Amino acid sequence: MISLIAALAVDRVIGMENAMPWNLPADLAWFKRNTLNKPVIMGRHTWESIGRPLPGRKNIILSSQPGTDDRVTWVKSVDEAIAACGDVPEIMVIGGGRVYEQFLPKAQKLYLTHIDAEVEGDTHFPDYEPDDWESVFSEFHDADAQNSHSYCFEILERR
Numbered sequence: 368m369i370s371l372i373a374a375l376a377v378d379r380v381i382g383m384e385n386a387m388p389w390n391l392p393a394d395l396a397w398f399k400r401n402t403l404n405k406p407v408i409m410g411r412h413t414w415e416s417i418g419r420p421l422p423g424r425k426n427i428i429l430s431s432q433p434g435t436d437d438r439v440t441w442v443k444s445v446d447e448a449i450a451a452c453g454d455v456p457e458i459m460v461i462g463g464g465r466v467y468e469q470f471l472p473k474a475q476k477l478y479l480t481h482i483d484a485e486v487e488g489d490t491h492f493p494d495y496e497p498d499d500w501e502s503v504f505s506e507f508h509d510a511d512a513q514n515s516h517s518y519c520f521e522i523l524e525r526r
């Protein structure tokens with residue numbers, strides 16, 4: 368099973384200038400809980416944005432060019448990325464925009480955080496078709512001293 372996990376600001380913005388400009392510790396904690404002990408697939412730009420391997424997860428990087436760091440696994444196509452995960456129950460695709468576009472048709476589950484923040488961005492989450500997806504979990508949180516925007520954790524499963 369393939370799942371996508373992402374945090375979306377208003378208008379599906381997910382990034383600006385190869386960064387995420389907000390800071391929501393509760394959402395990073397949610398990301399860690401839902402990805403720990405699973406393989407994570409990411410594109411090269413997102414690998415450069417994170418800047419280090421994510422511990423406790425098999426890190427698989429998509430790039431058309433040879434890898435430059437043997438602490439992670441480098442692959443050259445979507446099919447190779449999936450194969451490199453082996454026989455696991457759940458593969459987590461962690462972006463960015465181009466990678467999400469390619470894996471969306473193959474995904475059965477979306478873990479989405481909707482952040483009430485207006486962000487200028489240059490990268491968006493793919494338009495998906497709402498009729499294809501059932502919301503099976505949602506949990507709203509107001510802003511607090513640690514998290515400066517309200518946010519909504521949602522899990523959707525392909526109908």
Ligand SMILES: NC(=O)c1ccc[n+]([C@@H]2O[C@H](COP(=O)([O-])OP(=O)(O)OC[C@H]3O[C@@H](n4cnc5c(N)ncnc54)[C@H](OP(=O)(O)O)[C@@H]3O)[C@@H](O)[C@H]2O)c1
Pocket residue numbers: 372373374375380381382383384385386387409410411412413414416429430431432442443444445461462463464465466467469490
């Ligand atoms: N809010 C969130 O949840 C979230 C999550 C992840 C990322 N982001 C943000 O998203 C932005 C980065 O997204 P992005 O769309 O620019 O880039 P991306 O999807 O992270 O990376 C694109 C790169 O991945 C490689 N790639 C993708 N598909 C491939 C394929 N089929 N075969 C081989 N290589 C492939 C290529 O690398 P080469 O050029 O080396 O071939 C391509 O240039 C950043 O702003 C980041 O902060 C946000």
Ligand SMILES: Nc1nc(=O)c2nc(CNc3ccc(C(=O)N[C@@H](CCC(=O)O)C(=O)O)cc3)cnc2[nH]1
Pocket residue numbers: 372373374392394395396397398399413417421422461462479480
């Ligand atoms: N909901 C969601 N939020 C995100 O921030 C997110 N980020 C990415 C890609 N970028 C990043 C950037 C930083 C870290 C990171 O530092 N993660 C730590 C945080 C642990 C914690 O704060 O409790 C980790 O070990 O996962 C992960 C992914 C992909 N999907 C996401 N999905």
Ligand SMILES: [Mn+2]
Pocket residue numbers: 444446
């Ligand atoms: Mn092929």
Ligand SMILES: [Mn+2]
Pocket residue numbers: 453454
């Ligand atoms: Mn197999």
Ligand SMILES: [Mn+2]
Pocket residue numbers: 483484485515516517
């Ligand atoms: Mn806000």
